[PDB]
C-alpha cells in the first residue's frame, strides 16, 4: 500500500483571548493495481493529522478496472466547482496531470494518461472529482453484460 | 448565447494596453534629465529614493529610477531608460541603465556587476 500526502494546511479557530491553531492533512493510499482511496484528518499536530487521514483513506477505498495501465475511455467528472477530464494515452507517455490528480492516478496504478483541470483547483475537490471519475469509468465486459451482447459484438 | 446570436454578433476581444507606453515598442530610449531629485515611498516602506525626470526622444516626459548606491547624474545629463516598475514609488514605470551614456557604473561592487554596469576589477 503506497501512501501519498497531497496537502497539509494550518487552520484557525477564534476564541476569547486568542486563536487555537490546528492542522489538516489529505492523503491518498493505493495498492497500485486497481485499488485506491483517499481521506482527510484533522489534529493539533501534523503527525496525528496525517495518521488520521491515512486511517480514513484506508476506510474509504474503491476498485478500479483499468485497461492494462491506462484508462478504458475518456472521462469527464466534477465535484462542486472542480471539473476534471482524463484521457487514455499510449505507452511511454507517462502521467500528464497536476499534483492532486497525479497522486490519485499513481495510487490507482495508471501509468499513461493525459488529464486536465477546469475551474477551481482546490486539492480536496480535485481529488473528489478524480476519485468519482475513476469509480464511474466502465469496461467492455460490463457494457456487454448490461446490453446482453458479447464483447466481440460490442467491439 | 445561442448560435443565431453568435452569427448575428460575434465574440468581441478587448485589446490590451502596454505598461510602458513611453518606450513606443522599443527596448530602450534615449533621454535628457530634466530633473534629478529624491522622493519618499508609500507605506509600509520608508526611504529616500533617487529619481530623475527625463524628456524622451519619443516626445514623452517621464520619471525614471536610479538604482545602486551613488550616482553622478545632474540636470541636462543624457541617459538611456528601459522598462521596469518600482511598485513602491507611485508613477515611476522606468529604470535608468547604469553605465550606458552619461550614467556611470556603480563603484565598489563585485557581485551582479552586469547590472549597474561595473567593469571587472583587476
Amino acid at each position: 500500500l503506497v501512501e501519498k500526502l497531497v496537502a497539509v494546511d494550518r487552520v484557525a479557530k477564534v476564541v476569547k483571548g486568542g486563536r487555537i491553531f490546528s492542522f489538516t492533512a489529505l492523503t491518498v493510499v493505493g495498492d497500485g493495481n486497481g485499488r485506491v482511496g483517499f481521506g482527510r484528518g484533522k489534529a493539533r499536530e501534523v503527525p496525528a493529522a496525517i495518521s488520521k487521514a491515512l486511517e480514513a483513506a484506508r476506510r474509504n477505498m474503491i476498485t478500479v478496472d483499468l485497461a492494462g495501465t491506462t484508462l478504458q475511455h475518456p472521462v469527464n467528472a466534477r465535484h462542486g466547482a472542480s471539473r476534471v477530464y482524463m484521457q487514455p494515452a499510449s505507452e511511454g507517455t507517462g502521467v500528464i496531470a497536476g499534483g492532486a490528480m497525479r497522486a490519485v492516478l499513481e495510487a490507482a496504478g495508471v501509468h499513461n494518461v493525459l488529464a486536465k483541470c477546469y475551474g477551481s483547483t482546490n486539492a480536496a475537490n480535485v481529488v473528489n472529482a478524480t476519485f468519482k471519475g475513476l469509480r464511474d469509468m466502465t469496461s467492455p465486459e460490463k457494457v456487454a453484460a448490461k446490453r446482453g451482447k458479447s464483447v466481440e459484438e460490442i467491439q | 448565447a445561442t448560435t443565431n446570436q453568435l452569427i448575428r454578433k460575434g465574440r468581441t476581444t478587448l485589446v490590451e494596453k502596454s505598461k510602458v507606453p513611453a518606450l513606443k515598442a522599443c527596448p530602450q530610449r534615449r533621454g535628457v534629465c530634466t530633473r534629478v531629485y529624491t522622493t519618499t515611498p508609500k507605506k509600509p516602506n520608508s526611504a529616500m529614493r533617487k529619481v530623475c525626470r527625463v524628456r524622451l526622444t519619443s516626445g514623452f516626459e517621464v520619471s525614471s529610477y536610479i538604482g545602486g548606491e551613488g550616482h553622478n547624474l545632474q540636470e541636462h545629463s543624457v541617459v538611456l531608460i528601459r522598462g521596469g516598475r518600482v511598485k513602491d514609488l507611485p508613477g515611476v514605470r522606468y529604470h535608468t541603465v547604469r553605465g550606458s551614456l552619461d550614467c556611470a557604473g556603480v563603484k565598489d561592487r563585485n557581485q551582479s556587476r552586469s547590472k549597474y554596469g561595473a567593469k571587472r576589477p583587476k
Binding site: - | 448560435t3 443565431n4 452569427i7
Partner: protein
Amino acid sequence: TVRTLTGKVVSDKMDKSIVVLIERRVQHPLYGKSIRRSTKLHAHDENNVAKIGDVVTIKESRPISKTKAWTLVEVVEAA
C-alpha cells in the same frame, strides 16, 4: 460545357435586361450553422420574354454592357 445558374427575376424594367437573384446555402466557417447567401446578376433578354417572378436559367457569356455578362437560356417557370 457552359456555366449556368437558376434564379428568380426581381426586375425587368430596363430594355433587354433582367435582374436575377441567385440563392445559395453555405455553412458558417466557424459556427457551422447553414445560412443563406444571395447575389444579384444582370442578364440579357433579347426579346424581353422574362417577367418579374419567373424562374429562369442564365449562362455565362462575353460582356454585353458594363454590368451584363450573362444571357437568358429559358424560362423554367412563369409567374
